[PDB]
Design a protein around this nucleic acid. Structure first.
Ligand code: ANP
Lengths: 50, 183, 366, 62
DNA sequence: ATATATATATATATGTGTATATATACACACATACATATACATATATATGC
DNA sequence: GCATATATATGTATATGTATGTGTGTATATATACACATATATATATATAT
């Protein structure tokens, strides 16, 4: 509900399979390391634990 | 809003340098330092006396609460109320739900059955929602009284079925009903 | 501008910078002809207009006078409260310079052969009597908003502030107050109706005068508007909402042009105290069209309707009465009560966490 | 063309020609006034009331 | 021309079943973020300076 | 006619200080809404009748 992603399910024998169509008003970085840093910042796939 | 409900009678005596904007002298434009020095009115005890008084304060409270109703009643944006919540929290929304496919809804019983439903369903075609407990006496009942329960309404909400007319806009194409295998 | 029918004084430069106001217009000119004092001193035209008060060209007939000036003391009052005041006047044949200083205690008039045609008043205000020392930005903002409102009233006169042009249109000015304001323009009147959520708001102009404290005109216009709207809202929503309750939610931006025999209760001219027959005959505003246009709108009248029914529902929900021997004031469903509780006694209250641990209590207790 | 001749007046003629700044409102108008403690809608000329009140306030000042 | 005799479907309610949910304290020692503001660099521009 | 200079305004980027966690279960209690029927009860709606 911000006009950036539209998510759907693609699970199977493994769970957590989400197929996400990004929207045209969301910026895709051609800098792939900036893409990786921003997808880590927003989607939060890195969980840090002490 | 507080001070518009008061009739205030002021009597000022022996005032010094009473400057006025007009010949009629209807507005005292003397500076507030001279008047604040001259007027020795203790407004704190008058505030305490209207604090202790009740039939002045109760119109203030009633008009104030009606003012807050008018204040936070007319607000906010994105007034597009057709689905406040997309399906149900407990509902498994299919990926091809709403469009023309063989999109099948699962009406299981009990939320503790929600385990493994998502895992090996069809993600595009199969979808699910767990029901709760037992079902009302829906036979020959008025529409307004069956609409007031949430758990039968959401079925007619997650899918565009309306009680008064036929089914044309099915978000789920097939309806698979599975019940408990016991009595 | 008005006295030449907007051919002359059609550009007005009001430049306010460094505590100095320069107002220059291209009017026909303050006359060089001989005017006479009652004292017997023979004083020329612009210097008698700009040094001594009670002198001017608005002491003639009042029923045909459509100008905002009556008293003949105004520019002399500007000269009095200024430490420096020069007035350069050209009628097309001569330039009369009237220079005054030391709070007009020094005054001198002089004539140069020249060819200008207009008036330039350049003055630096005195700050000894006023409770200020400099002209801050709020004064320039008030003057610029006044030139904007005058350019809305008079689009033919090109007002400029500090060398910057001012465009005046009633539509953009009316949407500056509220973007849903209903407008209605006439040959002499121009009214916009909007919303006032935190009190009552108004702004009105008689000819070129900002009468911020009101007059008979806004009272007659709101009376004629409410005389059509109140039976209309009575047939529409069946609610008894008064004239003042409708009026206080409205912001009214009305503009009156070409008034005749304007009378004001003060020198500052903030209340038009002309007779109500004069203003009612002069103003040809169609109140029923404004009434139906704010009836058909859902964004002004319908908020008054929903606010009024909110007040009435809040009044209806406050219903209370008495009870026969109330138990422990606000009692609880699971709260068993001692029968001498509240009066002068040593009664004890019990606090447990179990409903099983009170079903034995009612027999074994006092 | 509007006739603009600079005329200079005495005290009495300037008061009688420009009575508005000197006696206030000189037209019959409707206001809401506390009479006898009551907030009642009255309609009158404030110039005559002010005309009496000048002498009244002069006597109270005396 | 409405007072009253009377009749009949409303409201618990019993127990059995069958299923939900919810307010809180606990505490690190970070995790993610919520803005957020804020100070400072530099650009342009325009109006002064010449 | 052209050098120029510095001023402030807005990007901007970081570094502050907070703010909300919920974590992840243990622990404490409580609430919820339905289907199965007769038995009263009650309360008020209509007839009539002088
Ligand atoms: N800047 C000006 N432009 C045009 N006319 C002017 C100007 N300054 C003075 N006058 C005229 O000089 C005369 C002096 O009158 P003045 O003292 O300005 O009073 P007024 O215009 O009647 N204002 P007021 O006394 O408040 O009602 C009048 O005829 C004015 O119209």
């Amino acid at each position: 509900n911000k006009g950036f992603i539209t998510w759907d399910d693609a699970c199977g024998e493994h769970g957590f399979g989400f197929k996400v169509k990004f929207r045209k008003e969301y910026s895709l970085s051609d800098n792939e390391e900036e893409r990786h840093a921003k997808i880590m910042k927003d989607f939060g796939l890195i969980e840090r634990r002490s | 809003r507080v001070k518009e409900c008061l009739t205030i009678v002021m009597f000022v005596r022996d005032m010094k340098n009473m400057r006025f904007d007009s010949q009629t002298k209807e507005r005292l434009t003397s500076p507030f330092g001279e008047i604040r020095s001259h007027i020795q009115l203790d407004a704190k005890k008058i505030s305490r006396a209207i604090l202790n008084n009740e039939a002045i304060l109760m119109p203030i409270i009633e008009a104030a609460l009606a003012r807050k109703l008018a204040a936070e009643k007319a607000a906010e944006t994105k007034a597009a109320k057709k689905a406040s919540k997309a399906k149900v929290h407990k509902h498994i929304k299919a990926n091809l739900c709403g469009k023309d496919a063989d999109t099948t809804l699962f009406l299981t019983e009990g939320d503790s059955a929600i385990g493994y439903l998502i895992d090996v369903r069809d993600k595009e075609l199969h979808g699910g929602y767990p029901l709760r407990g037992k079902v009302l006496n829906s036979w020959g009942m008025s529409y307004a009284d069956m609409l007031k329960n949430k758990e039968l309404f959401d079925i007619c909400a997650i899918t565009g079925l309306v009680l008064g007319e036929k089914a044309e806009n099915l978000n789920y194409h097939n309806i698979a009903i599975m019940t408990d295998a016991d009595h | 501008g008005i006295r030449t029918k907007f051919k002359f004084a059609n550009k007005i430069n009001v430049t306010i910078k460094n505590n100095q106001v320069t107002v220059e217009d291209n009017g026909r000119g303050i006359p060089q002809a001989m005017v006479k004092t009652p004292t017997g001193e023979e004083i020329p035209g612009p210097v008698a207009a700009w040094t001594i008060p009670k002198a001017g060209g608005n002491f003639g007939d009042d029923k045909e006078r459509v100008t905002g000036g009556m008293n003949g003391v105004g520019s002399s009052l500007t000269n009095i409260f200024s430490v420096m005041f020069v007035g350069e006047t050209g009628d097309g044949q001569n330039n009369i310079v009237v220079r005054c200083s030391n709070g007009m205690e020094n005054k001198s008039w002089e004539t140069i052969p020249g060819k200008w045609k207009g008036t330039r008043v350049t003055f630096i205000p005195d700050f000894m009597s006023f409770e200020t020392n400099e002209l801050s930005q709020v004064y320039l903002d008030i003057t610029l908003d006044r030139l904007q409102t005058l350019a809305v009233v008079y689009p033919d006169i090109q007002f400029t502030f500090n060398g910057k042009k001012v465009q005046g249109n009633f539509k953009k000015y009316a949407r500056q107050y509220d973007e849903h304001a209903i407008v209605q323009e006439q040959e002499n009147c121009s009214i916009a109706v909007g919303r006032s959520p935190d009190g009552f708001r108004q702004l009105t102009y008689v000819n070129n005068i900002h009468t911020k404290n009101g007059g008979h005109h806004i009272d007659c216009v709101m009376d004629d508007i409410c005389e059509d709207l109140i039976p209309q809202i009575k047939r529409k929503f069946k609610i008894d909402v008064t004239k003042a309750r409708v009026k206080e939610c409205l912001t009214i931006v009305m503009f009156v042009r070409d008034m005749k025999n304007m009378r004001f209760d003060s020198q500052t001219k903030e209340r038009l105290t002309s007779p109500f027959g004069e203003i009612r005959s002069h103003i040809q505003l169609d109140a029923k069209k404004i009434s139906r246009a704010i009836l058909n709108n859902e964004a002004i009248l319908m908020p008054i309707i929903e606010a009024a029914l909110a007040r009435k529902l809040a009044a209806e929900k406050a219903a209370e009465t008495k009870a026969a021997k109330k138990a422990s004031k606000a009692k609880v469903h699971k709260h068993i009560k001692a029968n001498l509780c509240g009066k002068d006694a040593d009664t004890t209250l019990f606090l447990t966490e179990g409903d099983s641990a009170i079903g034995y209590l009612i027999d074994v207790r006092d | 063309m509007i006739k603009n001749e600079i005329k200079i007046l005495s005290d009495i003629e300037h008061i009688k020609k420009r009575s508005g700044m000197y006696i206030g409102s000189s037209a019959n108008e409707m206001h809401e006034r506390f009479l006898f403690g009551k907030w009642e809608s009255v309609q009158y000329v404030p110039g005559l009331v002010k005309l009496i009140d000048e002498i009244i306030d002069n006597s109270v000042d005396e």
